[PDB]
């Protein structure tokens, strides 16, 4: 009947939920970047897991193996594109040196509060879903964006956002409407 489809799970838990030295560190990191839940850092770690796992079997060969050539260069370009690995630091063991906060930095919610316009990471995360930030020509509804080294310049309010202008917004729509009746009789 219906042709099959492929879907995947995007996160995985360690050997124990409760190890405070790990529970506390992520609690430190979650509030630092205003993270939503553990499942998201569970996702970035899993994403780190497969690239770091792919690091080994990439490098277990000689430097002149073309599969290493393609895969390593295919690896670094993605890392360079997303910019979690900066323009420098282009070594496979430097890839082995990657840390979680680096990906926590490339997050849009991290990037927006980095340069302002939100005055709060916690205000930031809702604000994108609240339709007040523009990355391209389309409204973005995700704080977890993984900016690919380009859109940071474009960071600003959405065109449909009253922050971007052109609207009085629900709050001033309703209250100015009730100004019309409460200003006089």
């Amino acid at each position: 009947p219906r042709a099959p489809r492929t879907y995947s799970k995007t996160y995985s838990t360690p050997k124990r939920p409760y190890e405070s030295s790990r529970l506390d560190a992520e609690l430190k990191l979650a509030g630092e970047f205003g993270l939503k839940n553990k499942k998201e850092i569970y996702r970035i770690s899993f994403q780190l897991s497969k690239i770091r796992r792919a690091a080994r079997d990439l490098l277990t060969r000689d430097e002149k193996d073309p599969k290493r050539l393609f895969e390593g260069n295919a690896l670094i370009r993605r890392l360079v594109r997303v910019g979690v690995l900066s323009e420098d630091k282009k070594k496979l063991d430097y890839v082995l040196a990657l840390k979680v906060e680096d990906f926590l930095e490339r997050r849009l919610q991290t990037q927006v509060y980095k340069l302002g316009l939100a005055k709060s990471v916690h205000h930031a995360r809702v604000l994108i879903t609240q339709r007040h930030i523009a990355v391209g020509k389309q409204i973005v509804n995700i704080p977890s964006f993984m900016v690919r080294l380009d859109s940071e310049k474009h960071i600003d309010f959405a065109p449909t956002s009253p922050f971007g202008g052109a609207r009085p917004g629900r709050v001033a729509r309703r209250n100015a409407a009730r100004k019309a009746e409460a200003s006089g009789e």
Binding site: A30, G31, G34, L35, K36, H122, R125
Partner: protein, 60 residues
């Protein structure tokens, strides 16, 4: 050995419990904002720091 049992004594504590109705305390955030305050609660406006961060300390 001994087998004679009584099953009417069930729920003795609940029957004898002097009930108190649930205390209406104002709502608190959840998810984003509550995560903000709880982290702030645990790292900014510290309550007990006597020797260590005792974290459900007895009130005294």
């Amino acid at each position: 050995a001994k087998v004679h049992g009584s099953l009417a004594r069930a729920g003795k504590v609940k029957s004898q419990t002097p009930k108190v109705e649930k205390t209406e305390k104002p709502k608190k955030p959840k998810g984003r904002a509550y995560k903000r305050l709880l982290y702030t609660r645990r790292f900014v406006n510290v309550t007990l720091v006597n020797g260590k961060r005792r974290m459900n300390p007895g009130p005294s």
